[PDB]
Amino acid sequence: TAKKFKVVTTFTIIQDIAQNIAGDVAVVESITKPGAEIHDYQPTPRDIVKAQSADLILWNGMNLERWFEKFFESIKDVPSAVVTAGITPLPIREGPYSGIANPHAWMSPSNALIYIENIRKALVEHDPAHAETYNRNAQAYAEKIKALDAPLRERLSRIPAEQRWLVTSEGAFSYLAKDYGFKEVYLWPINAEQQGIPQQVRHVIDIIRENKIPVVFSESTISDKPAKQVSKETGAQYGGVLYVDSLSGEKGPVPTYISLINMTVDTIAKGFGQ
Length: 274
Ligand SMILES: [Fe+3]
Prior knowledge:
Layout: E1 5-9, H1 12-22, E2 26-30, H2 45-52, E3 56-59, H3 68-72, E4 80-82, H4 109-126, H5 131-157, E5 165-170, H6 174-180, E6 183-188, H7 200-211, E7 215-219, H8 225-233, E8 237-242, H9 257-271
Parallel strand pairs: 1-2, 1-3, 3-4, 5-6, 7-8
Helix pairs in contact: 1-4, 1-5, 4-5, 5-9
Bound molecules: fe (iii) ion.
Subcellular location: Periplasm
Function: Part of the ATP-binding cassette (ABC) transport system YfeABC involved in iron import. Binds iron with high affinity and specificity and delivers it to the membrane permease for translocation into the cytoplasm. Also binds Mn(2+) and Zn(2+).
Pfam family, one: ZnuA
């Protein structure tokens, strides 16, 4: 066991999934830090260094990392793989990004199985000496992710179907909402320039009041102020922060992808009174 195969990912969700497949034969690091905004992140010379010293670079595609393709052109002789191949996208419904794929496909546990299979194939292709370990680790992790779905689905099914309204800041939860039958309301469709401007706020306020939606949420890499504004003006309680674009630090409450799905689903269910 000389030097461990080095994998660099764009953000922390992919880092944790890939580290579970790599096990102890590879080290996986994320370019963005926990808590950092990933859509419009601005790479630094130190990020170039990290990616250039990798053996494999992983990214989401589906229009998530607006910075990645310009950044990756600075990198020489390091293979890359997009980990969303074979996932059927949901389009962004409005705004300047309307009609393109919604990137947040990892918020569906079923989609996470496809992430695992793509990351496995990329590790096996570019570090073939350890293929048996990658294959074993992916089979074990896919079994955890597969089993994850049933208890989450049952928990959210307790919410009456006609009251299943997921009101968030970024419209980052479209794939989770589809899986579990939630109608989706958000202050902005995807992180970009306009985030909490008027028109956006008042539309969400109108849908809340008409449907008596009991809770509204923010997310961990953006400001909580628009959601708290919405809850102050309506009957909705502020449900807290959901995790989608970033894990927490390893010593925080959301250190893993499994913990992220569990925490987001639990926070939603609590927002509805379980
Ligand atoms: Fe996002």
